[PDB]
Design a protein around this ligand. Structure first.
Ligand code: CLA
Ligand code: CLA
Ligand code: CLA
Ligand code: CLA
Ligand code: CLA
Ligand code: CLA
Ligand code: CLA
Ligand code: CLA
Ligand code: CLA
Ligand SMILES: CCCCCCCCCCCCCCCCCCCC(=O)O[C@H](COC(=O)CCCCCCCCCCCCCC)COP(=O)(O)OCCN
Lengths: 80, 165, 41, 143, 97, 68
């Protein structure tokens, strides 16, 4: 499966979760941002690597990162 | 006689090319009545060809084994053999015009970045300012080297965006 | 008028004007100086 | 949520004819996903596997071969009618796993109950060079 | 039932929108900041379905664009006939085609 | 807290973050968070990035006064 890594630069805007087409991200409580929210990836085995979460990230560079590798049936987006 | 090239005036193949062009021009000319517009156009073309072949001669031009003129490239060799105006002076004129264009564009960029929303001035040109800078660039090299001297031509690397290593 | 003047102040219009001016200058130079190759007088 | 709902295969399917982008042989060999919702009235929606279907007034159950189709239907129902659906995953042996509303409040919210995993406590670009992690099996972003 | 339905003067004939290049869409109404904006200005220029959601204004724009294309075609045809009139040998060709 | 945690609001700052798009660039301070978050300094830039945004959050150590 792919690797989804979320850093402390996230502002908890929940844009990456809304842009996620497979429900990989989530919001957890936090204290390092004004919104008191932090992105998490508890379902990274269902991610395909579409990088839609990175498109919705408003911070400079990327507070969420997707790294491809070790494709599976779920990661390849196969219905067969 | 440099580079094994004969001058165009003393060349042989140059005359063959001139006669061939005049011969095909006359062959095209003979198909029309003398009092016609195509006859006048072909006569003007023949006159222009003769004038071009005469002006390419008596100017230091050299051609080798095909009658097609060759341009002497190295300055000094071109300077001592009357070939400076082939490429040495045309690049000087081109450098003058290119520096004119670059200095005018640089002045427009600097003067347009001062006001609020400079992108609007970039995409909607200030025509009086552009024409004023157009007629003020005749001394571009003096101004360019003086901005080089006072350091306003160059920007410090601390203020320039740098890609990560 | 000033709206029309700012329309002519846009980049494609001044580009067309510059292109027309430069093309006309080069064409009239080449017509009145037929076949220039060697810088001599 | 407060109590995780259980999948009911006896719930009626929405009014729809035949399907071509539907279940392949992966459904009977590997897992397949099942989306359920509770329509308050009779209305026509668009399936992500083909044309249009009509959902029945009451419980509605649909089957898909991919989780992305289930979440696409979920977000279409949430944006169009504010339906709040939920989908399960059924394996070949019949194991049912609850997928979308893990805490029942949707991943846009927080609920103060989830634990943040796969999070790096350093800024991006502070990761070590690939020379630092060589012949070790650990990526610079995995530490 | 079928009748002419026409609104009188919905759009004022002014040059105020010629000064601002990006005006048909809200994305280009804020002005340019990157060069792709320029390409966008030349991409969504005649995408009238994206500028407004009203079908009436889209239909009016389509009608006027068709009139403009017909005017362009007629200008081209008039130019063809003018070139045949002056810079041509059509009369000479008629004798021995 | 005495004075403020960050720079003066509305003052120009230079971003020292190397991975940021606006490295060695000048921006304007919009707000500085007093709660104690990791990146409290909000900086707005005239030139947008490839994503189209123009505002970002930076820490105290990656912002300095612009050189003149
Ligand atoms: C870097 C490119 C380049 C190259 C390859 C040449 C090559 C040449 N130059 Mg030139 N030259 C150049 C640039 C160059 N030039 C420039 C930029 C200038 C200043 C305007 C000159 C000024 C110059 C003079 C004044 C003379 C040459 C001459 C020569 C020739 C012999 C040079 C030698 O050492 O003997 C040779 C064809 C000599 C020559 O004519 O050869 C007989 C000669 O007298 N060169
Ligand atoms: C019919 C004639 C003709 C035409 C159409 C061109 C066309 C072109 N030339 Mg060429 N050139 C010609 C004759 C011609 N050349 C001749 C006869 C010479 C002398 C032998 C040169 C020498 C020359 C050089 C050295 C360069 C060009 C460049 C260019 C291109 C871009 C010019 C530019 O950026 O805009 C106008 C210029 C600007 C907007 C910016 C100003 C930049 C200029 C070049 C600097 C001038 C001042 C500088 C300090 C002098 C030293 C130059 C340095 C290389 C040593 C363009 C395709 C440039 C190019 O292709 O770059 C990729 C370039 O660097 N030309
Ligand atoms: C007048 C503005 C201006 C100036 C001063 C420069 C200067 C420079 N450019 Mg740039 N460039 C410009 C405009 C300008 N460029 C534009 C508009 C483009 C898009 C086509 C580029 C694309 C470009 C590339 C892709 C490259 C450069 C490079 C260079 C360097 C080499 C010199 C040269 O002639 O390159 C040659 C430049 C060109 C061939 C571009 C010519 C584009 C048009 C024809 C000129 C525009 C003139 C402008 C409209 C005048 C405005 C006046 C105002 C009153 C309206 C130099 C630092 C090179 C570099 O990095 O070298 C270190 C390089 O690789 N430039
Ligand atoms: C695909 C990408 C792209 C695109 C769409 C553009 C597009 C543009 N750039 Mg850009 N550029 C690019 C890449 C690109 N560039 C790159 C890679 C570089 C190198 C970093 C540059 C560097 C650059 C510089 C330095 C400048 C531009 C400018 C321009 C504009 C040129 C036309 C104009 O306003 O002058 C109009 C064109 C004319 C010929 C007018 C000249 C003035 C005449 C002589 C007045 C007299 C007219 C009269 C009727 C005769 C236009 C908005 C210029 C600008 O903003 O406009 C000033 C400018 O200064 N660009
Ligand atoms: C009639 C249809 C038509 C056509 C064919 C074009 C074509 C063009 N326009 Mg557009 N435009 C149109 C209608 C049209 N426009 C309308 C109705 C509007 C609303 C008022 C605009 C507003 C508009 C803006 C605001 C700008 C353009 C620009 C451009 C250029 C795209 C950028 C480019 O070339 O790369 C980038 C090119 C360069 C960096 C080169 C710069 C230097 C060049 C050599 C000078 C320009 C000379 C030009 C190419 C020749 C005249 C135009 C030609 C169509 C006759 C291109 C020449 C851009 C532009 O000026 O780019 C040239 C630009 O900024 N247009
Ligand atoms: C902007 C560039 C430019 C320039 C510098 C000229 C310059 C010239 N043209 Mg020209 N012309 C141009 C563009 C230009 N034209 C364009 C775009 C067209 C097409 C509409 C024409 C069509 C045209 C015709 C039909 C004729 C000229 C003629 C002339 C000459 C007399 C006009 C005069 O006093 O000009 C100012 C000159 C200062 C030296 C002169 C050499 C006439 C000619 O041959 O003169 C005897 C002539 O009969 N031109
Ligand atoms: C980049 C390569 C390149 C180079 C170096 C040349 C160079 C040349 N070609 Mg070629 N050509 C090229 C590309 C090139 N061309 C391409 C791509 C094409 C295909 C489109 C052609 C097609 C072509 C043809 C069909 C012909 C040429 C010709 C020419 C000559 C033109 C000289 C001229 O006009 O007199 C010199 C002109 C000037 C110096 C212009 C004056 C400009 C200065 C700045 C003064 C400005 C005027 C004014 C005083 C300014 C003040 C007033 C102002 C404010 C209004 C020259 C040898 C002609 C020729 O004679 O061949 C030998 C010819 O018949 N070429
Ligand atoms: C009855 C004719 C007709 C009509 C009314 C439309 C209308 C429309 N089309 Mg369609 N289309 C047509 C024919 C037509 N199209 C045909 C025949 C094709 C096949 C090629 C297409 C392919 C097509 C695509 C792929 C797309 C559209 C889109 C659009 C919309 C916006 C177009 C726009 O803004 O372009 C603005 C104008 C331009 C960008 C200029 C185009 C210039 C071309 C690319 C190059 C010119 C070639 C020229 C002959 C050679 C130049 C040489 C050079 C030296 C000068 C609009 C709804 C777009 C859309 O968003 O739809 C909603 C879209 O994505 N159309
Ligand atoms: C289909 C449309 C079309 C096309 C492709 C052309 C194309 C052409 N025409 Mg033409 N023309 C057209 C419509 C068209 N015209 C119409 C509708 C009329 C009647 C108003 C004319 C009247 C006309 C005349 C009277 C002449 C041309 C000429 C020309 C040539 C040069 C034009 C030029 O550069 O002027 C440049 C002009 C400017 C830059 C400003 C003016 C060119 C082959 C000329 C030609 O072929 O010379 C022998 C010429 O003398 N045309
Ligand atoms: C610095 C450049 C110095 C060049 C000195 C040239 C002296 C000889 C001279 O003026 O005779 C020719 C007359 O050309 C002319 O039409 C005069 C050009 C004047 C050159 C100096 C400015 C120029 O050399 P040429 O026309 O025979 O050269 C071949 C074309 N490139």
């Amino acid at each position: 499966a792919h690797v989804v890594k979320i850093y402390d630069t996230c502002i908890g805007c929940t844009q990456c979760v809304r842009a996620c087409p497979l429900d990989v991200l989530e919001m957890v409580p936090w204290d390092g941002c004004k919104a008191a929210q932090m992105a998490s990836s508890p379902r990274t085995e269902d991610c395909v690597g579409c990088k839609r979460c990175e498109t919705a990230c408003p911070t400079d560079f990327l507070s969420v990162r997707v790294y491809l590798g070790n494709e599976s049936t779920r990661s390849l987006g196969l219905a067969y | 006689d440099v580079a094994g090239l004969t001058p165009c005036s003393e060349s042989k193949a140059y005359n063959k090319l001139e006669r061939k062009e005049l011969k095909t021009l006359e062959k095209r000319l003979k198909k029309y009545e003398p009092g016609s517009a195509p006859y006048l156009a072909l006569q003007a073309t023949k006159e222009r060809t003769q004038n071009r072949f005469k002006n390419y001669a008596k100017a230091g031009l050299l051609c080798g084994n095909d009658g097609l003129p060759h341009l002497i490239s190295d300055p000094g060799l071109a300077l001592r053999f009357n070939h400076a105006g082939e490429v040495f002076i045309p690049t000087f004129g081109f450098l003058y015009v290119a520096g004119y264009i670059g200095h005018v564009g640089r002045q427009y960029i600097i003067k347009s970045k001062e006001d609020a929303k400079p992108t609007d001035k970039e995409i909607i040109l200030d025509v009086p300012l552009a024409l004023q800078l157009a007629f003020q660039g005749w001394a571009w090299p003096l101004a360019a080297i003086q901005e080089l001297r006072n350091g306003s031509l160059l920007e410090k690397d601390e203020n320039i965006t740098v890609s990560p290593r | 008028m000033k709206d029309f003047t700012t329309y002519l102040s846009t980049a494609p219009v001044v580009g067309l004007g510059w292109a027309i001016f430069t093309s006309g200058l080069l064409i009239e130079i080449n017509r009145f100086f037929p076949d220039p190759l060697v810088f001599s007088f | 949520p407060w109590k995780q709902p259980e999948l009911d295969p006896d719930t009626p399917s929405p009014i729809f004819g035949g399907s071509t982008g539907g279940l392949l042989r992966k459904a009977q060999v590997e897992e397949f996903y099942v989306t359920t919702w509770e329509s308050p009235k009779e209305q026509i929606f668009e399936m992500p596997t083909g044309g249009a279907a009509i959902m029945r007034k009451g419980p509605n159950l649909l089957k898909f071969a991919r989780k992305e189709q289930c979440l696409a239907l979920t977000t279409q129902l949430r944006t169009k009618f504010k339906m709040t659906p939920c989908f399960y995953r059924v394996y070949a042996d019949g194991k049912v796993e609850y997928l979308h509303p893990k805490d029942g409040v949707y991943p846009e919210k927080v609920n103060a109950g989830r634990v943040g995993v796969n999070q790096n406590m350093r800024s991006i670009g502070e990761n070590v060079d690939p020379i630092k992690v060589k012949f070790t099996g650990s990526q610079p972003f995995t530490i | 039932k079928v009748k002419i339905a026409v609104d009188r003067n919905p759009v004022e004939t002014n040059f105020e929108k010629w000064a601002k290049p990006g005006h048909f869409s809200r994305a280009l109404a804020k002005g340019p900041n990157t060069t792709t904006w320029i390409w966008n200005l030349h991409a969504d220029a005649h995408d009238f379905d994206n500028h407004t959601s009203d079908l009436e204004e889209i239909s009016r724009k389509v009608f006027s664009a068709h009139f403009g294309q017909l005017g362009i075609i007629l200008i081209w045809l008039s130019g063809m006939y003018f070139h045949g009139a002056r810079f041509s040998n059509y009369e000479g060709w008629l004798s021995d085609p | 807290k005495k004075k403020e945690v960050g720079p003066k609001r509305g003052s120009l700052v230079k971003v020292l973050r190397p991975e940021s798009y606006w490295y060695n660039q000048v921006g304007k301070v919009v707000s500085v968070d007093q709660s104690g978050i990791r990146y409290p300094v909000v900086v707005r830039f005239e030139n947008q990035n490839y994503a189209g945004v123009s505002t970002n959050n930076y820490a105290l150590d990656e912002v300095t006064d612009p050189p003149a």
